[PDB]
A = this chain, B = another copy of it.
Amino acid sequence: GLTDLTFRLLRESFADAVSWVAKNLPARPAVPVLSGVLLTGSNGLTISGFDYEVSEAQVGAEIVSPGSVLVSGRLLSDITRALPNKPVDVHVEGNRVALTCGNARFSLPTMPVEDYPTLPTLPEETGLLPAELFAEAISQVAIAAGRDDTLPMLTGIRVEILGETVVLAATDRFRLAVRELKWSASSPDIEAAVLVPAKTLAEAAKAGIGGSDVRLSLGGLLGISGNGKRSTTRLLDAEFPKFRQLLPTEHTAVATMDVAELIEAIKLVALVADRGAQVRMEFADGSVRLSAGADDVGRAEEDLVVDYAGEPLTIAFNPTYLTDGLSSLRSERVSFGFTTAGKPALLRPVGNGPFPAVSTDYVYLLMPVR
């Protein structure tokens, strides 16, 4: 072609696609080519970005002349977001791209297309589910994943598929979050058990708020599809704890409270906790006493009503991990399932012998503090 890539499309459409693709580009590009986003005109425009998480968006466009061009992804996402709200005209002119929109005009340098790495092929579709369910279930468990890249075995979200049932889990050794959901399997009997980096999976699930059903592909990659968007994510090569056997089926003591009231009380009392390390909880019939701090800085104390069953128990928790757990339930009330002060508490959304645990879709296991 004598006329290289030339097209026209709406700014909003172009800007959303480029920003979505450019997001996952390398933070420290080895070659300048790795900082680019590929634009391919055929029908429609494809916007492609390569990395350990590669992404491709496809949008409607008027392709005056087809072709391909590689330009700085970050600068193109910044230009497109800021352009006048008018149609955007793009014309490749040799080694430059002329971008016109209303009264604004740009001339951008290009990088060689031949050097851009080919994006991996997504595996075969494993199943699908609504965007709202994927977004809300992932965000629920993501809160427990480790955020330290020095301990990468803690940085994933475990995904286990047993036909129509999906179990999600995350942990950082101080807390374990587990969520079960139903999905449209493609086809029944499909078994899969992978560990996906938590940060990218959570960002993909939050962006999914379309809606539009999210298609997951596992046949070392997790494929994510829908909304004219397609991405691949390298899976984590780490073992995950046997989370199912760590969840107790019975409790020696059970406490039910109001989440909002308890979150507020933790935050008040924790102002005097030395380096925000612990909040002590003294449960007895009808009441829990929350306390924190030492005389040198200050002491705090608040009593809250509890629907309690069992012998009195005194247990301490890290205030942030406790509020993360409470915040993740999305229920008015919380159930605390206990054994001893040195064994985990089970938080679930809501007369002397032990108490069988209640079946819920979500659970947050929280380790105590001594």
Say yes or no: B107 contacts A298, CB within 8 Å. Answer: yes
Question: Are B297 and A106 in contact, with the CB atoms below 8 A?
Answer: no
Is A75 engaged at the interface, CB distance under 8 Å to the other chain? yes
CB <8 Å contact, A103 and B267: no
Judge if A274 is at the interface, Cβ distance under 8 Å: no
In this assembly, does A268 line the interface, its C-beta being within 8 Å of a C-beta of chain B? yes
Contact A106 B304 (CB under 8 A): no
- Bound-state CA distance A105–B96 (Å) is 68
What residues of B have a CB within 8 angstroms of the CB of A303 in the complex?
103
In the assembled complex, the Cα of A269 lies from the Cα of B268 at a distance in Å of: 48
User: Are A296 and B109 closer than 8 Å at their CB atoms?
Assistant: yes
Residues on the B chain within 8 Å of A79, using CB = 268, 271
Question: How far apart sit A269 and B105, CA to CA, in the bound complex (Å)?
Answer: 9
A108 interface residue, CB < 8 Å from B?
yes
Instruction: Name the residue in A103, A105, A108, A295 with the highest tally of chain B Cβ atoms < 10 Å from its Cβ.
Output: A103
Q: Give the interface size bracket for A toward B.
A: 20 to 34
Known: A83-B268, A271-B75. A297 touches B109 (CB 8 A): yes
**Residue in chain B with minimal CB distance to A74:** B271
| Contact B302 A108, beta carbon cutoff 8 Å | no
Q: Looking at the complex, which one of B78, B295, B299, B304 makes contact with A103 (CB distance below 8 Å)?
A: B304
Instruction: Report yes or no: A82 in contact with B300, Cβ–Cβ below 8 A.
Output: no
- Given known pairs A75-B272, A79-B268, the reply for A295 and B107 (CB within 8 Å) is yes
Query: 0/1 per residue, A281-303, Cβ < 8 Å to B?
Result: 00000000000000111111111
Chain B residues whose C-beta falls within 8 Å of the C-beta of A96 in the assembled complex: 295
CB distance from A14 to the nearest CB of B (A): 15
**In the complex, are the beta carbons of A299 and B267 less than 8 A apart?**
no
**Bound CA–CA A297/B265 (angstroms):** 53
Residues from chain B with a CB closer than 8 A to the CB of A302 are 103-105
Would you list 29 pairs from A and B whose C-beta atoms are within 8 A, ordered by A residue?
Answer: A72-B298, A75-B272, A75-B297, A79-B268, A79-B271, A82-B264, A82-B267, A82-B268, A82-B271, A83-B268, A103-B302, A103-B303, A103-B304, A104-B265, A104-B301, A104-B302, A105-B301, A105-B302, A106-B272, A106-B298, A106-B299, A106-B300, A106-B301, A107-B298, A107-B299, A107-B300, A108-B298, A109-B296, A109-B297
Chain A positions near chain B (C-beta within 8 angstroms): 72, 75, 78-79, 82-83, 96, 103-109, 264-265, 267-269, 271-272, 295-304
Interchain residue pairs A-B with the least CB separation, the first 10: A107-B299, A108-B298, A104-B302, A82-B268, A105-B301, A78-B271, A106-B300, A103-B303, A103-B302, A104-B268
